[PDB]
Enzyme design. Structure first.
Site, short mmCIF file in Angstrom:
data_model
loop_
_atom_site.label_atom_id
_atom_site.label_comp_id
_atom_site.label_asym_id
_atom_site.label_seq_id
_atom_site.Cartn_x
_atom_site.Cartn_y
_atom_site.Cartn_z
CD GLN A 9 8.27 -12.74 2.68
OE1 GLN A 9 8.04 -13.70 3.41
NE2 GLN A 9 7.32 -11.90 2.28
CE1 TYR A 10 10.02 -9.49 4.82
CE2 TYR A 10 9.81 -11.63 5.86
CZ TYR A 10 9.24 -10.47 5.37
OH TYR A 10 7.87 -10.32 5.43
CE1 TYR A 18 7.94 -7.82 -0.65
CE2 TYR A 18 9.45 -8.83 0.90
CZ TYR A 18 8.42 -8.94 0.00
OH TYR A 18 7.84 -10.17 -0.25
CB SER A 28 4.42 -3.24 6.99
OG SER A 28 4.71 -1.92 7.43
CG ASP A 76 12.01 -8.39 12.37
OD1 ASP A 76 12.54 -9.38 11.81
OD2 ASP A 76 11.08 -7.73 11.86
NE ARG A 118 0.16 -2.01 10.08
CZ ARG A 118 0.37 -0.89 9.40
NH1 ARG A 118 0.95 0.15 9.99
NH2 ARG A 118 -0.01 -0.79 8.14
CG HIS A 123 6.26 -14.54 8.62
ND1 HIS A 123 6.61 -14.97 7.36
CD2 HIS A 123 6.35 -13.18 8.60
CE1 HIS A 123 6.91 -13.92 6.61
NE2 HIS A 123 6.75 -12.83 7.34
CE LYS A 238 1.55 -7.86 -2.81
NZ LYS A 238 2.48 -7.28 -1.80
#
Length: 257
Positions: A9-10, A18, A28, A76, A118, A123, A238
C-alpha cells in the site's frame, strides 16, 4: 507489518499517488481542508506537546505547528514515508518525524497535550488497538486530549463480497464506530465523544474524485493509466459504500480527566 506496508500500500509510488489525490503533504482523507475542520475546536499554544500517530508525509504536524506553534512529534512505521516527510521540513526544531513502531515505542507518562491520529489505527488488530489506547492514556497529560479519525464499518455480518475483499487485501481491522468508542471507555478515557462522519467523508471523497477526473492528463503523465483506473475505481467504491454506511468514517475525541 512494516514490510507489508512498505512493499504494498505504501510503496514510494503508492504514497505519491495518494498525495496527488489527497493534497500536498497528505495521505489521509480530506487532506488540508479536513485537517482544518478536525482541529477547529482544539486549543494549543507554543508550549504544547503533540504526538501524531501515523504522521505520513507530515502535513498534520506541519499544520499543527503552523497554527499553534506547538512542538510536534510524528511517528510512522514506514521508513520510506518518514524519509519523504523529512525532506519537506527544514530549519524547524519543533517538528520531528520518527520511523518506529508505536506499539513498542516508549514515551514518558503524562507527556502530551494532544495525541492525534488520522486514518492510521485501522492497520492494527483489535488486540493492538486496545494496547495502543492504553498506552495513549498513560502518555497523555492529565489535561490532555485524544483526537482520532479512523476507517470504521458496519457490523461484519452485513459486509458484501466486494467489501470483504477490500478489507482482506488491505489487511485492515475495521470495527464499528460504537465498538471503537467502547474501547476508549474501557481504557478509562473521559468525555468520550464519537461522531459517525460518513456523510462528511462522502463529501470529501467526491471533491477528491472530481479533482482526479479534472486532472487526469497530469495524473497520466506522472503515473500511468493502470494506476489511474485503480485509484478511480477505489474512490468510486468508497463513495458507494459510505453512502450506504457499509464503510464508515469515525471521529473520536476524549480526555484523560
Amino acid at each position: 507489518d512494516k514490510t507489508f506496508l512498505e512493499n504494498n500500500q505504501y510503496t514510494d509510488e503508492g504514497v505519491k499517488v495518494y498525495e496527488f489525490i489527497f493534497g500536498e503533504n497528505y495521505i489521509s482523507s480530506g487532506g488540508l481542508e479536513a485537517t482544518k475542520k478536525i482541529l477547529s475546536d482544539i486549543e494549543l499554544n507554543e508550549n504544547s506537546k503533540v504526538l501524531d500517530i501515523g504522521s505520513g508525509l507530515g502535513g498534520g504536524c506541519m499544520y499543527i505547528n503552523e497554527k499553534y506553534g506547538a512542538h510536534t512529534h510524528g511517528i510512522d512505521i514506514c521508513s520510506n514515508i518518514v524519509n519523504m516527510a523529512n525532506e519537506r521540513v527544514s530549519g524547524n526544531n519543533k517538528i520531528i518525524f520518527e520511523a518506529n513502531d508505536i506499539l513498542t515505542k516508549e514515551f514518558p507518562e503524562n507527556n502530551f497535550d494532544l495525541i492525534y491520529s488520522r486514518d492510521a489505527i485501522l492497520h492494527l488488530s483489535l488486540e493492538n488497538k486496545n494496547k495502543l489506547f492504553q498506552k495513549c492514556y498513560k502518555w497523555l497529560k492529565p489535561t490532555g486530549t485524544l483526537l482520532i479519525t479512523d476507517y470504521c464499518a458496519t457490523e461484519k455480518e452485513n459486509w458484501d463480497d466486494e467489501f470483504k475483499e477490500y478489507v482482506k487485501q488491505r489487511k485492515y481491522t475495521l470495527i464499528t464506530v460504537e465498538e471503537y468508542a467502547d474501547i476508549l471507555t474501557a481504557c478509562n478515557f473521559k468525555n468520550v465523544v464519537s461522531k459517525d462522519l460518513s456523510d462528511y467523508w462522502n463529501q470529501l471523497l467526491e471533491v477528491e474524485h472530481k479533482y482526479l477526473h479534472e486532472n487526469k492528463e497530469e495524473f497520466l503523465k506522472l503515473f500511468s493509466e493502470k494506476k489511474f483506473i485503480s485509484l478511480d475505481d477505489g474512490w468510486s467504491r468508497k463513495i458507494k459504500d459510505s453512502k450506504r454506511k457499509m464503510q464508515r468514517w469515525g471521529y473520536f475525541k476524549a480526555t484523560k480527566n
